[PDB]
Each structure stands twice: as C-alpha cells, then as structure tokens.
Amino acid sequence: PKEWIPRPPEKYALSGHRSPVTRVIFHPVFSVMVSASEDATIKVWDYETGDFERTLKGHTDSVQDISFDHSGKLLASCSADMTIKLWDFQGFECIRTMHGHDHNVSSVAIMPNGDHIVSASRDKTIKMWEVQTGYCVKTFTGHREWVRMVRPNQDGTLIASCSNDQTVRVWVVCKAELREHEHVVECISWAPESSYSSISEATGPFLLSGSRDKTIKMWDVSTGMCLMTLVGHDNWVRGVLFHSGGKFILSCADDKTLRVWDYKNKRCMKTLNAHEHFVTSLDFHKTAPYVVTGSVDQTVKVWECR
Amino acid sequence: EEQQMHLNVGLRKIKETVDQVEELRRDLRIKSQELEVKNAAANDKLKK
Amino acid sequence: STEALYQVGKEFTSKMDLEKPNYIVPDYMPVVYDKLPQPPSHREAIVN
C-alpha cells in the first residue's frame, strides 16, 4: 500500500463528454468519482466499472472547482456565473446557491468540520459561508490579483490560498506571507500527518504548491521559508497533491506528463504520457489503488496503481 | 438556468466573431502594404 | 390542524432552494400559524 504508482496504459477512458474537464475528485466513502467541466455540467462516474452514472446540471457557466464533504454526502461546486452551488449525494439536487462574489470563482472547498464553505474568485477575496442557510460570515482581503486556489487545513483553523500576486497567504480564523515566487502560483497541496517523519528523515503543518514557473516549491508555515525546490517541469504546473502514505509527491502540468516526485532526492522517476493535450487536474484515492487525471481534451482517464 | 446558459454561450461566439473581424482587418492591412511594395518594385523595374 | 399544515409544508419544501439571505421582515406579517419562529426567514414566510 505504498508502492502505488500509476502504470500504462489507461484502465478506463471516460470520453462521454463534450467540453473540457477542469477538476476531478474521488468520493471519500462511495466508489464513485465526479468531474467538473466547461459546459456547466458535473458528471458522476464509477471508476471501478467505467460507466457513466448521472450528470448534475444547474450551473449557467463553466464549472471551475468541486469539493466534497468529509462524510461524502455533501458536494460544493463553484462556477463562472459567480455562484457557489451546493449539492447533496442523497437525491442529487441543488440545495442552495450562494451569491456575493464579484467575478469568476476559481476554487471551493468544504471545511473539515463540515459546516463552512471557502471560496476564491477573481475579485481577490476569500469568502466563508454557512452550509445551513448560505449566508456569508467572513471575508478575507490582502490579495490584489486573480486568486486561483484555496485549500484548508486538517483542523478547520488554517486556510491557505494562492493568487496571481506572487504570494501564498495563510489566514487564521494573516499568519504568514510568502513572496519569494517568480511567477503566478496556481495550485496548493497540504501535507497530511503521514509525512512528518518522512520529511524529518529527508530534511508542521507543511505547504506544497506548484506554479507557472515550471517548478514546485514547498514551505513551512511555522517559519515561512522554502524547504526544497522541485524543478524539471517542461510547462505550466496545474495540479499537485501529496501521496496518501506521505512518501511520494504527485503532480501534473501542461507538458502532458505525470511526474511522481519525492523529497528524499528531488528527482523524477517516471513520466506518464496521459493525454494528447494539457492536463488540468488529478486526484489520488486515499485507500484504493487508482489515479484519475482530468484533462482539457474533453476526456477523463483512470490509471491503475501497481 | 438552461436558457441563461444558452444565452451566455451565445455572446462568446459574438466576441470571437468580433476578434476574427479585427484580425482579418489587420491581415488585409499588411497584405495591402506588401501589395503596394510589390507594385512599387515592379514600377521601378519597368522604369529601369 | 394549522400546525399540521405548517409541518407538512416545511418538511416537503425542505429540499427546495427557498433561502433569501437579504430578507426584510415586514412590520405587520399577518401570521396564520401560531408559535411561528419570530423573527421569520424566507422559508418560514413561504410555508406560512
């Protein structure tokens, strides 16, 4: 349960789509996965079988990011129509729609306590909402450009967001500001508790983030300094994430390659020819041996992990 | 919501058509410039 | 009873998007269900 690395070829090619795919995630409990899109559709697939289950229409513009509740019964999606729509996995119907963002929303995530929703749009603000009634509670300011991704911590108290302002701000419900970037930072991955011993051997909580600077760099929120710099990407990095066991680093970029990294030696071991065009997002199953990558060529592919 | 989505997609095509018209205007400008260059070269050659 | 009608309506329309955060509670608000939660929300207004 540690040697799980994606291997060629694709197990299943979920090509039942018509528009580019932006985000893909795994269900924490059930054996399904969902996928956002550009044509205001969220489609649920069965990654074990490869069969299309259902679609969740109701957005009026391109869906940017999607995230699940801890229990897996609640789904939150953000789109380009300035809305944070809320979905449940009991009857698969829209529960509430939250307005209040001045432009395109690019990120969303359920708080680990399962009561608040974080969001990040182009208007350089971070909004916190209530899952019970859709009423905003707090707003966060300190960015001056497009905010791409926001990712909470494992306790619901630390919130990290990346923007086009060459910064990765951290807020406590600002703890730190990191301004040693050289281009726009795009994606944020949080370090789980199963990697502290591994990184102490190699070198909390820790923050890892890719960017459009052809490299990945990682800091410490307790000190605000870069630990190790991971370089070698041939194009813009779109998505990064930690391995479930906390030993490997999974990332994707526009070079159509999945490079699996490690902080023991900071080098690439195998690049996977995933799609014929750019790769937008990917996810790693916490227990099952499966990797799914969401790409911008209107295809979703699932990789076996051996 | 479906009607609003169809209207919102419809305006993007108008924006793309505007951009295509502008780029075709730039193309015809540079093509007219090189055509005038060729005509001037031909007239100079005939004068020679 | 009026309480039965209110409870049936609330339980049936609990799944619908009837939340308006910028709801202005009227001064009068003619109430037909007693023991309605004061101040009401938009969902309570709809069921009432």
**DSSP letters along A223-282, please?**
TTEEEEEEE--SS-EEEEEE-TTSS-EEEEETTSEEEEE-TTT-----EEE--SS-EEEE
Q: Are A109 and A89 in contact (CB under 8 A)?
A: no
Q: Give the Cα separation of A43 and A17 in Å (integer).
A: 9
- Residue A40 placed within a domain: yes
Cβ neighbors of A87 (< 8 A, separation 6 or more) are A42, A56, A74, A75, A76, A77, A93, A94, A95
Q: Give the Cα separation of A75 and A91 in Å (integer).
A: 12
Q: Are A131 and A115 in contact (CB under 8 A)?
A: yes
Q: Which of A59-63's residues contact partners 24+ apart within 8 Å by CB, and which partners? A: A59/A83, A59/A85, A59/B1, A59/B5, A60/B1, A60/B4, A60/B5, A60/B8, A61/B5, A61/B8, A62/A19, A62/A22, A62/A37, A62/A38, A63/A22, A63/A23, A63/A36, A63/A37, A63/A38
**Are the Cβ atoms of B4 and A60 closer than 8 angstroms?**
yes
Please give the single-letter amino acid code of residue A84. Answer: I
Q: Give the Cα separation of A55 and A80 in Å (integer).
A: 18
Phi/psi for B12 (5° steps) reads -65, -35
**Are the Cβ atoms of C21 and A134 closer than 8 angstroms?**
yes
Closest Cα in chain A to C14? A95
Resolution in angstroms, to 1 decimal, for this deposition? Answer: 3.1
- Residue A6 placed within a domain: no
Q: Are A280 and A298 in contact (CB under 8 A)?
A: no
Q: Number of A:C CB contacts under 8 A?
A: 15
Cβ neighbors of A192 (< 8 A, separation 6 or more) are A154, A242, A244, A246
Q: Number of A:B CB contacts under 8 A?
A: 13
**Are the Cβ atoms of A59 and B4 closer than 8 angstroms?**
no
Taking 3-state DSSP, the helix, strand and coil percentages for chain A, each rounded to the nearest 5, stand at 5, 50, 50
**Are the Cβ atoms of A58 and B4 closer than 8 angstroms?**
no
Q: Give the Cα separation of A111 and A109 in Å (integer).
A: 6
Cβ neighbors of A229 (< 8 A, separation 6 or more) are A215, A216, A217, A218, A266
Q: Do chains A and C touch (3 or more CB pairs under 8 A)?
A: yes
Closest Cα in chain A to B5? A60
Closest Cα in chain A to B12? A61
Residues of B in contact with A58 (CB under 8 A): 1
**Are the Cβ atoms of A97 and C21 closer than 8 angstroms?**
no
Is residue A174 exposed (0-12), middle (13-18) or buried (19+ Cβ within 10 Å)?
exposed
Q: Sign of the CA dihedral A81, A83, A89, A95?
A: negative
Count of beta carbons in the 10 Å neighbourhood of residue A261: 21
Give the SS3 label for residue A148.
strand
Residues of B in contact with A57 (CB under 8 A): 1-2
- Residue A212 placed within a domain: yes
- Residue A193 placed within a domain: yes
If interface means Cβ-Cβ distance under 8 Å, which residues of chain A face chain B?
A: 40, 57-61, 81
Cβ neighbors of A132 (< 8 A, separation 6 or more) are A115
Q: How was this structure determined?
A: cryo-EM
CA diameter of chain C? 31
**Are the Cβ atoms of C41 and A133 closer than 8 angstroms?**
yes
Asked if the peptide bond before residue A205 counts as cis, ω within 30 degrees of 0, the response is yes
Residues of A in contact with B8 (CB under 8 A): 60-61, 81
Q: Which domain holds residue A109?
A: 11-306
**Are the Cβ atoms of C19 and A91 closer than 8 angstroms?**
no
Q: Which two tokens stand for residue B23?
A: 């780029």
**Are the Cβ atoms of A96 and C21 closer than 8 angstroms?**
no
- Residue A3 placed within a domain: no
Q: Is the CB of B4 inside 8 Å of chain A's CB atoms?
A: yes
Please give the single-letter amino acid code of residue A156. Answer: G
- Residue with the two structure tokens 């508790």: A193
Name the minimum distance, in Å, from the CA of C47 to any CA of chain A. Answer: 16
DSSP element (H, E) containing A127: strand A126-130
Neighbors of chain A with 3 or more C-beta pairs under 8 Å = B, C
**Edge-first strand listing for the sheet containing A185-190:** A185-190, A206-211, A215-220, A225-231
**Are the Cβ atoms of A57 and B4 closer than 8 angstroms?**
no
Q: Are A59 and A81 in contact (CB under 8 A)?
A: yes
Tell which phi-psi region holds residue C23, choosing left (phi > 0), alpha (psi between -120 and 50) or beta: beta
**Are the Cβ atoms of A95 and C17 closer than 8 angstroms?**
yes
DSSP state of A192: P
Closest Cα in chain C to A90? C15
The total number of structural domains in chain A stands at: 1
Please report how many Cα atoms fall inside a 13 Å half-sphere around the Cα of residue A265, on the Cβ side: 4
Q: Give the Cα separation of A247 and C14 in Å (integer).
A: 45
Name the minimum distance, in Å, from the CA of A69 to any CA of chain B. Answer: 25
Cβ neighbors of A220 (< 8 A, separation 6 or more) are A204, A206, A207, A227
The alpha carbon torsion through A72, A73, A79, A85 (nearest 10 deg) reads -150
Q: Give the Cα separation of A217 and A229 in Å (integer).
A: 4
E strands present in A2-72: 12-14, 24-26, 33-35, 41-46, 51-57, 63-68
Q: Are A147 and A159 in contact (CB under 8 A)?
A: no
Q: Which residues pair with A47 in a beta bridge?
A: none
Q: Give the Cα separation of A135 and C20 in Å (integer).
A: 9
From residue A222, how far is each of A97, A205, A302 by CA, in Å? 36, 8, 36
- Residue A4 placed within a domain: no
From A137, A121, A35, A126, select the one nearest A78 (Cα to Cα). Answer: A121
Q: Give the Cα separation of A282 and A272 in Å (integer).
A: 13
Q: Give the Cα separation of B15 and A125 in Å (integer).
A: 28
Q: Do chains B and A touch (3 or more CB pairs under 8 A)?
A: yes
- Residue A2 placed within a domain: no
- Residue A123 placed within a domain: yes
